């Protein structure tokens with residue numbers, strides 16, 4: 001919500017309260033999953049060719065006790081400041097989205113699941129700390145519909161090596177016309193010494209790229225995505241040496257509020273030390289959201305797992321149904 | 330404070346800053362006790378028979394250092410979303426108040442102490458996670474003043490068994506007219522396997538109920554409460570097998586802002602393994618609040634303990650004086 | 659930002675997002691330093707002689723992962739409530755600034771570094787919990803420009819002895835006239851039982867004082883500060899028995915937004931068990947801020963260390979450069 005708008009500064013205070021329950025035979029995917037979000041987004045007119053901005057956003061879990069587990073799963077998601085230069089681009093620095101998510105985002109539209117290859121603290125695939133990002137939308141006022149980005153990532157040496165990284169760079173590009181769109185992105189970075197002493201994954205470089213296509217118009221959404229990761233997909237005991245990742249989704253928006261969705265996700269891991277080849281994501285998803293208005297909604301999401309019992313990286317293979325009730329402002 | 334109200338959505342951002350000091354021999358009840366609260370509460374008109382809503386609230390302690398103890402005592406208190414269907418009731422889901430607090434609340438009006446049998450993560454007696462709640466005010470438009478609710482609780486398997494529960498149900502009912510009110514509530518739920526392995530308390534089911542009466546008019550507040558808990562009152566080393574719980578309060582509001590208060594609290598535990606019967610709450614309370622206006626107040630509260638020296642359940646038995654200065658919005 | 663102003667109550671919601679990066683050969687001062695701040699400050703008119711107020715403020719680090727280190731370095735900075743009595747002063751209680759920071763603050767104007775002797779949970783040099791503070795500005799309306807304060811500090815017995823204190827008191831005084839100002843302040847406190855068993859610093863009593871003056875007008879800022887601490891300057895392994903502390907700074911504000919700065923800081927610790935005398939702070943600082951307007955700015959700060967590589971307290975001696983981009987509201 002815009003709660004301040006005066007003398008060239010605007011300030012949005014936004015958030016949501018999400019009542020949420022999972023039903024599944026798995027232990028870790030069953031029970032209460034309620035949570036809340038809070039953030040600000042501000043914008044200030046400096047002159048005719050320059051505008052400054054900033055944003056912060058946090059996750060408050062609603063399924064902890066008020067005792068020793070109170071802080072579990074709570075965290076800042078975004079935190080950055082930047083400058084917008086008229087037609088000539090934007091630059092911002094802080095905790096933000098990696099450029100490979102410009103591609104991975106196109107199938108990340110399910111009511112509760114989806115988006116499985118874009119994760120936090122994972123080089124360029126999701127939200128990461130220490131990113132410097134330049135974007136130019138509409139290509140300096142001449143080739144509109146054509147968007148481009150370039151990004152630098154500074155080293156983060158963390159106690160948890162699966163959430164660490166060394167220096168890297170990324171780039172992305174997308175074009176839209178008449179409801180059709182296409183996008184691609186590539187990034188690469190150094191791995192840290194601690195990442196190279198883990199049980200899975202060998203190599204000096206982490207690389208991620210993905211590419212995709214969509215039609216998004218006339219109440220219709222379709223998109224398909226393919227990509228690959230080297231020494232970069234995060235697994236339970238380290239990183240996969242290489243992966244092949246694919247997803248696809250189809251949705252329609254009825255005028256009276258309902259929006260059904262069907263999707264399929266499959267990813268295969270390759271040359272895991274002592275294990276070989278094996279699927280690490282594989283499921284069909286069917287669900288729907290009902291929008292009462294722009295502030296209230298409800299949903300059901302049904303994840304139909306198609307991994308098997310002899311899964312050889314030990315990944316769980318049960319189903320889940322999710323039921324959600326959302327108030328947002 | 331209402332900070333936004335536009336096109337059918339309203340958003341109240343509320344909170345307070347409480348400067349607070351305890352005087353006592355206890356040690357765990359003697360230093361600085363300063364804290365702050367922040368929350369939002371929102372409401373959106375969907376159509377003439379349907380409003381959506383959501384609420385979140387958090388506690389930030391003000392008596393920690395900025396070092397390693399910085400997070401001690403910090404937590405989410407409330408987090409839920411719901412739908413109100415005109416006269417046919419309301420439904421919300423998340424972290425909210427258990428229905429037995431509909432009765433326990435009537436003597437929870439002291440300046441600093443009081444409310445001792447209604448606590449967090451304690452089945453239905455206070456704030457608990459995973460509550461699905463139905464309420465109906467005014468009985469479908471037919472009986473003005475008459476309220477009831479029905480509530481389901483999903484199990485919470487936590488590392489701390491004293492803050493856990495299994496599945497359960499609860500219900501409540503109250504009537505008000507001409508300044509008088511009356512209320513009762515009952516709930517029951519399964520206990521977890523770990524709750525059945527603690528040194529105090531044995532049994533498969535936990536039960537809580539309480540009932541009360543009040544007069545609230547002409548600057549006068551009086552109320553009395555009686556109830557009992559089975560395998561559900563939390564003690565130092567587990568749960569009491571049975572309890573008998575009683576409290577009573579009397580207050581008067583002078584026109585120039587001062588509001589004195591006196592109360593008495595007595596609770597008895599029965600058949601504790603290796604101990605037998607013994608009081609676990611027993612005290613007299615004297616205090617006063619002075620309201621400067623609806624945003625500012627100050628108070629003193631004097632708790633006069635009557636538990637016995639070196640008692641057999643190990644409960645501390647000292648007095649405490651509390652002094653507070655409160656800014657709220 | 660002022661977001662509510664109605665019937666005598668107003669509420670300011672304020673904060674900032676700071677993208678910040680450090681460059682240095684010291685590994686503990688290198689990489690991402692992004693963070694964000696959020697707070698409220700409210701005020702309520704009671705009558706012609708009486709205003710209530712309250713404030714809370716929090717620090718959210720932006721350079722943690724979303725995993726197990728998420729809460730690292732996050733904390734409440736301020737939390738207090740108070741009363742303003744027209745001309746005859748103010749009183750507040752909670753977590754606030756100690757009165758010796760009335761003096762130390764005059765050189766705490768660098769873009770990033772500086773302010774080294776005023777720190778959190780350090781008796782009266784910075785922000786501390788449990789402070790009762792009385793101030794009188796303008797000396798009852800009689801002696802204009804002349805400010806006075808007196809303060810009581812309650813005991814904080816914490817697990818970390820380096821962030822503890824016993825009971826104490828402080829006082830300060832300042833005068834301004836014609837762009838010139840002068841200030842001095844003194845406080846003294848008991849030390850806790852555990853503080854007296856550390857490797858460095860002995861005595862059952864702590865003391866702090868500082869004094870300084872400034873010229874602040876016609877786009878010029880100049881100021882110098884000197885003070886001393888007994889059993890109160892916090893070092894790595896306890897407290898220095900005595901210190902001599904000095905700082906000085908000079909700044910000019912150009913009309914088009916630029917503000918360069920130079921400063922020099924030197925503090926010497928004296929009579930350290932097994933060490934004798936040794937410097938614990940020593941550097942030259944050059945930097946500048948560019949203000950785009952009152953909501954957006956950018957800065958570079960260059961810390962030129964002049965401690966020696968064989969320092970007897972083992973304090974690191976490399977240089978650091980900080981670059982920052984700041985949005986605030």
Ligand SMILES: CCCCCCCCO[C@@H]1O[C@H](CO)[C@@H](O)[C@H](O)[C@H]1O
Pocket residue numbers: 348349350351352353359360361652653654751790812813
């Ligand atoms: C609005 C409340 C302001 C209270 C001012 C603090 C009163 C100082 O109180 C002191 O602090 C210590 C802890 O209880 C004790 O050891 C002292 O006996 C007590 O006098």
